[PDB]
Design a protein around this ligand. Structure first.
Ligand SMILES: CC(=O)SCCNC(=O)CCNC(=O)[C@H](O)C(C)(C)COP(=O)(O)OP(=O)(O)OC[C@H]1O[C@@H](n2cnc3c(N)ncnc32)[C@H](O)[C@@H]1OP(=O)(O)O
Ligand SMILES: CC(=O)SCCNC(=O)CCNC(=O)[C@H](O)C(C)(C)COP(=O)(O)OP(=O)(O)OC[C@H]1O[C@@H](n2cnc3c(N)ncnc32)[C@H](O)[C@@H]1OP(=O)(O)O
Ligand SMILES: NCCc1c[nH]c2ccc(O)cc12
Ligand SMILES: NCCc1c[nH]c2ccc(O)cc12
Lengths: 146, 146
């Protein structure tokens, strides 16, 4: 359940669905992306209670991409926090990470694969096959403060 | 955690967040609403892997309502399969069950409470405080078979 995606020269990219993601490495990444720090114990609790945590590492190991899902292990899953290191965006890695994520969940027989997308990346997911408000279904938040 | 909601005669409604829901009683309720049969092993796996399951019982026990939620135990929950017996709809019980669900989750310190609303009941969740597509964020499904 580990893979080597590509090899370049002057490093590789390794997808994993294991879960060895060090909350300090992840923190480092979220910073690069400008996210605000969250209690590392609470981050560690979210990775532990996530049905699927998928990783891209850049060996020469180095966290350069992550996605994770919750799921009821049976019917539904929801994809959260898929992020890719700025100096690796625009290379196909977000696509590859997502493709394998979906594939992993299909292989575990999750039939309903959902997520919530910012307006600026909705197109990135429609290309991957995601379909917004199908049949007038709406995705709702309790008193969001964004 | 177990509460008595109302008392009537000619019976009391009981809210529980305990989790002990019989998959046979649940399947009975999903037929009463016309849902399709699903592998009891899988139904049972989706309840055990649901961060919160909340039940409505009619004692004189009879399962008359249910809602569950997945969560990463830290940041996000998603509320699925909330349903109440047609014999008991129109009485406030859907509303009561939802309020306590939300309160239980806030209690547990989940800050992001989300769900996916069918068209005919989107209004029902707006009245409870749920806001659709807040500032551009779209709920999305991968190749929905609807
Ligand atoms: C799940 C949620 O709740 S929201 C998701 C959270 N994710 C984030 O916000 C992370 C922030 N964004 C990023 O880190 C990245 O820029 C991503 C993940 C959005 C894109 O990752 P990248 O690696 O740059 O994209 P990738 O290389 O896979 O590009 C894939 C394809 O989508 C297109 N694409 C790339 N970025 C975007 C974008 N921002 N919007 C729309 N399309 C895009 C690319 O052109 C490419 O097209 P093609 O291959 O068909 O020619
Ligand atoms: C979770 C998801 O994925 S989407 C939702 C999934 N659930 C289902 O599809 C099951 C279908 N739902 C039902 O059968 C139930 O009727 C529910 C869940 C919609 C509501 O249960 P009820 O107990 O009948 O609703 P309840 O009696 O609590 O009524 C609460 C309030 O909502 C209103 N309401 C009831 N049904 C609806 C509706 N379809 N749309 C909007 N408002 C509604 C009621 O008028 C009432 O208003 P008021 O108290 O301000 O006068
Ligand atoms: N789900 C709304 C997008 C979103 C989800 N989690 C987030 C965390 C930080 C942030 O800036 C944005 C988000
Ligand atoms: N709002 C009910 C739509 C619906 C129809 N069939 C379903 C099965 C499962 C579920 O979560 C939802 C549905």
């Amino acid at each position: 359940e580990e893979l080597v995606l590509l090899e370049r020269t002057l490093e590789q990219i390794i997808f994993s669905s294991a879960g060895d993601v060090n909350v300090y490495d992840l923190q480092a990444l979220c910073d690069k992306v400008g996210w605000p720090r969250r209690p590392l114990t609470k981050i560690a609790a979210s990775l532990r209670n996530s049905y699927l945590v998928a990783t891209l590492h850049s060996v020469t190991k180095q966290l350069i991409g992550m996605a994770r899902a919750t799921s009821d292990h049976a019917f539904n899953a929801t994809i959260w926090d898929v992020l890719v290191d700025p100096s690796y965006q625009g290379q196909g890695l977000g696509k590859a990470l997502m493709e394998k994520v979906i594939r992993t969940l299909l292989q575990r027989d999750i039939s309903n694969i959902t997520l919530f997308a910012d307006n600026k990346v909705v197109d990135f997911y429609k290309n991957l096959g995601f379909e917004a408000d199908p049949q007038g279904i709406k995705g709702m938040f309790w008193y969001p403060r964004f």
